[PDB]
Point group: D2
Chain length 358, copies 4
């Protein structure tokens, strides 16, 4: 993909940078030109980059410098040799130095430009392709790697969406259920979810979501989800046969899916279980994973899979002799894996604008 | 019920004593003679009784003294005027002074005599009726109030069991389903549960449940449950049609039930909603309640209902135009409500041994 | 104080309204005319008023309505019979309808006009007396009740400040030290503090306090404090003899002060203990309290004292035979008590503008 | 040290094993023969060894096998090539197969044999030297590496103590204060401490420490310490000039020291600060560490120093122009570093019974 920019430098924007460093690609394949956020103090950025409450220390050298010598405060990050420019946040993306800086693919991480025309200002700033790191609205095309990232059309798709974190976990499960031919005549899902950057420490103000403003670490907070819905988007086979809800509980990372569906033919949990495990070793490799150990949420932190099927949980917990009525359980680190998928899409698209394959 | 004894004085045994007190029954109707635990320092008991990290300060006067004046340390609780005797914990219940203290109904709260013959040792110490405040085994009778407490037979049942907390929350749900004639042909359930006194603070030893031993306030911990199972005991109609699992999340009290079921004949969530709200006002009154405000877990503390139906959560989150495939959400304060049902059971059983009716 | 207005309706502004209500002063003595925040949906206010994750459910009747019937959504709170007006938040306080609504004492609770000229804009909107519910700057007068509230001068002070919470807890401590004649020649202090509405749930952006931005419920976070500092303002006697720091620990409410000081003339902790317990019963009554039970943080919730002296903790933990080198431990519910002092200050100031004395 | 046994396999016993693996010494220098705990299911042990809620995954291969082929369940751990025997827990250490198994130094981690004669049963089981991983009583000799581990006398000291975790953090600080000649005429200390394996998840039973049985993750719990006291033991210069207390707050690892002392000569914080930093690079190397970044508790997890001096915290927070009255701040991961020190003592002692130096 080579020339890359990053809009909004926190958590995902931070984990996204990090993945492409950890996967050894910075300055051989992907060239992060600049990052942009609510400032340009390059050493806060370096502080944020080295020390993380959940995922741990950065395993790389972080350094700072000034572009030009009339600056006041260092304005460039120098990660493992490479120079990335800190740029000053803008209320409207049209005012980004994209074309000038020499950026062609930009990655959206603010959370303020979900609507497709909004994010489209990046193109107008001389950016060339936009990937919205969340569920976009207004006719942006949604991709879920390993389920439908082959629909990507270099001529058609210009501002795209990489879906949600929960959509990315649910989608790979439904795909092999449909493809190996068990089916979903209908389905319902819960997600037990870690708290995020949009919750408050103490009872706060949330005038659209009343329940969401309440004290984050003191509660279980029922909440809504669009994850299922969007699946229909990515697998149009399944439109309006699925839905769900979310509970937010006081854990700082990692989350899980609880899927209850009715099948299209007579099976057993035993046969589904075996199908899944095997897609792990074949076509869904490195997207879908699986486990048969007795693990807890702590144990998937920094796990770069999109979806990890908990085998004993499922087998242990369905009705015996049943033929259609099944539940499935699947983990996912909501920051880490999704962030990898963001880089995965970016390389794919590039390669495909015949921006050199890999 | 007049003469009562309590075996194991913590959490449940503490909540249970407190219940009958707040419900004003101590010394008019129920007569707590003695309690027993891992000692006989009555002031540690009083300290334990007056201050609680979750439910708050005791609204009653606590006081200690000694039975006879050659004792060493006070051994009688003097609550709001009444004199309860602190009694020394025993490895074997057949060694309790039940007959002698003059105790006839005894409340098992240790967690150590769930097996019917074990818990029968109380009858052997001169005790007369024994309620197990937890799912028993070995042919002890299981009761759920407002669901089947009327099958109680003064002649037949002497060691009985008031189910579990989750069984007491799910049970009334399914009840009015079957009754108002919706049916459950097949059902699956999840409960997101607060942690308990059997988890560990840090990674611990749990050779029976490996996942249970992990650090409790740092994890989501999948776990099993017999709760649905036991429902078919209480409503035989539904034997072998129900099952589910639990998730232990880092909250100290309150929990929630997520039921997903398939109806027996066509309906709409609209009508199921209504039927549930009516049952609240009629036959299931004070057992099952409902809410249509935007409450979170913390809002259910010290709520003495068995099951509380969350209406917005439900209505918001089902499929449109659906006939048979439905999901229901119900809250419950896992300590409190269950402690009140325990008292409710003792009284019923009492009046029924023509131990004077109310 | 009769006519009152409140600026910023959360936590403190919510606790402050609640205080005068529980202390039965709404509509006899104090007259809350209007409140103002980031909107005017009076039912979100009522939802906010009735349910609290820490302090519990409102013991009063909450109700909403509209001022005039061309409004769109209810805009008046109707608490226990009284009609408060919801008023639209303003970037600049000189744009408040103070004069017009007929408001004379206004309570600043936003956290945005600490600078004396800024907070003076209220006088400019027709308001008459302004209390800053947080340490102010720029020559605003600082008061601490039961320590120096008597220096208040109806003619002199118009924009005033009720200190901080920690300043309100430490201050009374040092007071009776100096008075009973022990002296402080030099002192240092730590407070172990609960987290607040300015921390972040996950690793966040805090370019001013770098350590402050880190995940709040996962850390011990050293931090500074001006609390001792401001003490020399309130007791000038001790200027430049005090200082200390804070540690932010993962609890939602309540905090503690750990004072270490050097006396002016010989004594024993035994005598210091006694003097403190007496002051509780005499001149500092209702401000400073004490305890000699084995209470933990949770036991201080909704405790309306300014400072609570932990006697066992202190006596247990000083050097034997020591004359001058001493450590003192005092608790405090950082939200609640301070909200009550704020009301206490308004009344005092009121009566003093001969706004009728109590 | 070569032949080593381990009594009680959790947390320290686990972190102690782990250190000597991580420091590359298993089966070149230290030979762990067997471990012993509340069972002999070698694969739980392997589960406990690989997955840790706080510190992360084991970076090594874990495997299981049976000693002899009539066993029922694997009974040997096979870590990175090496075979360690799982042995069955005993109520009295005299009944350990120490001499037979071929063990000479054993490491005590149960917590049940602190009294010197109790732990001395290991010698009587054919063990040769005992190191109690905690503060022993009854005339065991206490060592604090890098402060007085040179007093060790191969002929005199047979059951020794490696002190406490807090004693290990405090001791290195006082040592360079005394040695560089600033002094301690007197001192007082607080420690803000992570919760441990002896706290309860919910209000529990703790009849010696009432405050310690309360709900661990919901409170700040004042507590007592012997740490200061024991310093006098290790630095007899300082006997009865020091004391302290502990607060336990809801964080699962890492803790910090707050030291307030009066010096023996006129100095400045600037000169102390410089002394410390420099002992880091000289004689106290790898025991005492230091930092001048803006870090929080999460950032020292798995930090193998005994004591880490927070430079900005101290400098930021003392009185200006002061000459005698000072506080110091210092971090420590309570499991990790202390566990390294345990191995450090063991090698030292060995080398010294002329069990071959290094
Ligand atoms: N963290 C997760 O679990 C997760 C998973 C999948 C998707 N997402 C999505 O990613 C997006 C970001 O989430 P987040 O948690 O990483 O957010 P943060 O972690 O809340 O990131 C937001 C950043 O935007 C910056 N910012 C705000 N306005 C800006 C502007 N005008 N210009 C530049 N920067 C600006 C902020 O300074 C901040 O650093 C969301 O929209 C969310 O839907 C999050
Ligand atoms: N609070 C809940 O979530 C809940 C709800 C429903 C049922 N229950 C059940 O009730 C039982 C008690 O749980 P708990 O939470 O109160 O446990 P705790 O809260 O762990 O109660 C146990 C008490 O029993 C005492 N004890 C142990 N052995 C004893 C003996 N031989 N004689 C006398 N006292 C003895 C202990 O000292 C302790 O005080 C369990 O079996 C549990 O399944 C709990
Ligand atoms: N609870 C405590 O620990 C405590 C104790 C003593 C003092 N204080 C102080 O009181 C102040 C408030 O703290 P807080 O905890 O209540 O904050 P919140 O709890 O964060 O309160 C802030 C409220 O102000 C509102 N607001 C913001 N801008 C506004 C505007 N321009 N007009 C009207 N309303 C506006 C916000 O919507 C929000 O509702 C702070 O300055 C703080 O220092 C807090
Ligand atoms: N974890 C810390 O922060 C820390 C730091 C310094 C010192 N320590 C000390 O280490 C000791 C252990 O603490 P811990 O937290 O690691 O304990 P755990 O983590 O509570 O370890 C105790 C182990 O002892 C085992 N056990 C009990 N009885 C036994 C027996 N008869 N034979 C063999 N094994 C037995 C248990 O199964 C358990 O695994 C304590 O005495 C404490 O003083 C702890």
């Amino acid at each position: 993909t080579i020339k890359v920019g990053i809009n909004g430098f926190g958590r995902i924007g931070r984990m996204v940078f990090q993945a492409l460093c950890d996967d050894g690609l910075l300055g051989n394949e992907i060239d992060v030109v600049a990052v942009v956020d609510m400032n340009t103090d390059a050493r806060y950025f370096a502080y944020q980059m080295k020390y993380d409450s959940v995922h741990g220390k950065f395993k790389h050298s972080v350094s700072t410098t000034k572009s030009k010598p009339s600056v006041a405060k260092d304005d460039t990050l120098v990660v493992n040799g490479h120079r990335i420019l800190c740029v000053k946040a803008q209320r409207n993306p049209a005012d980004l130095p994209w074309g000038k800086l020499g950026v062609e693919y930009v990655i959206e991480s603010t959370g303020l430009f979900t609507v497709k025309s909004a994010a489209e200002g990046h193109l107008r700033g001389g950016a060339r392709k936009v990937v919205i790191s969340a569920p976009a609205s207004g006719g942006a095309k949604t991709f879920v790697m390993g389920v439908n990232h082959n629909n990507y059309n270099p001529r058609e798709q210009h501002v795209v969406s990489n879906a949600s974190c929960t959509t990315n976990c649910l989608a790979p499960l439904v795909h092999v259920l449909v493809k190996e031919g068990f089916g979903i005549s209908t389905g319902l899902m819960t997600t037990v979810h870690s708290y995020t950057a949009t919750q408050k420490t103490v009872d706060g103000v949330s005038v659209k979501d009343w329940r969401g403003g309440r004290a984050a670490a003191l509660n279980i907070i029922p909440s809504t989800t669009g994850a299922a819905k969007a699946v229909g988007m990515v697998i149009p086979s399944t439109q309006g046969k699925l839905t769900g809800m979310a509970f937010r509980v006081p854990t700082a990372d990692v989350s899980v899916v609880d899927l209850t569906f009715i099948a299209t033919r007579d099976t057993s949990i035993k046969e589904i279980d075996a199908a899944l495990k095997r897609a792990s070793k074949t076509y869904m490799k490195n997207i879908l994973g699986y486990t048969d150990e007795e693990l807890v949420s702590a144990d998937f932190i920094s796990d770069s899979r999109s979806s990890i099927y908990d085998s004993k949980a499922t087998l242990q917990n369905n009705l015996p002799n049943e033929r259609r009525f099944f539940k499935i359980v699947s983990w996912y680190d909501n920051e880490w894996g999704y962030s990898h998928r963001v880089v995965d899409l970016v390389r794919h698209m590039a390669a495909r604008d015949r921006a050199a394959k890999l």
